Nucleic acid binder design. Structure first.
Length: 259
DNA sequence: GCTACCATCG
DNA sequence: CGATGGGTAGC
């Protein structure tokens, strides 16, 4: 009975003072993938490293209060990979992998390119360097879940006003069909869309105007699953009862057995 | 303060 | 449509 959550905490300390720590236990989650810690190893308290006795593994950026992802788990990972293996994106801490035998879960914070053009390009090199990486993992022959902020909305149904954002970062054509290739060419399963092909399921809302209140949001938080495991998904939900961030926790369940 | 991260008006 | 301005966490 497996349960995985993907939450972009927008600063783990802020989220913790907004009630995320209690949520980690309350949700009953077995594995929690968090992105955008906005903190370093020294900035982390004991509770932000091993919440409720869970094991934890993180990858922080060089500069302070920026990016950083982590993976918490009720069980001890028999393996852990920090960073992807490339200097350019590993100096930003955007990747953590945890192997639990046959299972393999990953917290990922794909770079955003909405700040500037150069950021957009770094995002593209990230796509071009992470693409073959996705392929390798598929050919490993194991159950793998890739949770995180991909900062890309796949189709028109994945965001409220898809008309005004066709020229903006996160919903550019080449991005959209980069994701399209990730789903079809490699056979990765966009779990939410597969479980519910007609439900928007927004996971992020801008700080602008009445974005959150009017439900003008994006679905940029994913759990890309392998087929043999994707077929074991039983349900999914976007938690919005409490607000720990501008993002919302993505909860997915799997009829699974670790034995 | 500064830096990084598209909804709303005309 | 295109032009115009943002709240938030952390340094």
């Amino acid at each position: 009975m497996l349960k995985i959550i993907s939450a972009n905490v927008n600063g783990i300390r802020s989220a913790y003072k907004k009630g995320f720590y209690e949520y980690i236990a309350a949700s009953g989650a077995d594995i929690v993938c968090v992105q955008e810690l906005k903190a370093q190893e020294a900035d982390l308290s004991a509770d932000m490293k091993n919440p409720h006795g869970m094991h934890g593994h993180w990858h922080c950026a060089e500069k302070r209060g920026y990016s950083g992802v982590a993976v918490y788990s009720k069980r001890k990972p028999d393996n852990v990979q920090i960073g992807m293996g490339i200097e350019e994106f590993d100096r930003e801490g955007r990747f953590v992998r945890c192997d639990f035998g046959r299972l393999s879960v990953i917290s990922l914070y794909l770079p955003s390119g909405s700040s500037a053009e150069e950021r957009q390009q770094v995002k593209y090199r990230f796509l071009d360097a992470f693409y073959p990486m996705l392929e390798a993992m598929k050919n490993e022959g194991r159950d793998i879940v890739v949770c995180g902020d991909w900062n890309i909305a796949h189709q028109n149904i994945d965001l409220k006003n898809w008309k005004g954002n066709q020229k903006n970062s996160g919903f550019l054509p080449e991005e959209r069909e980069w994701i399209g290739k990730v789903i079809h060419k490699l056979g990765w399963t966009d779990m939410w869309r597969t479980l519910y092909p007609d439900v928007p399921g927004y996971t992020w809302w801008s700080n602008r105007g009445q974005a959150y209140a009017k439900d003008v949001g994006w679905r940029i938080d994913y759990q890309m699953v392998t087929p043999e495991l994707a077929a074991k998904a039983v349900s999914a939900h976007v938690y919005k009862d409490e607000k720990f961030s501008d993002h919302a926790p993505l909860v997915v369940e799997y009829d699974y057995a670790a034995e």
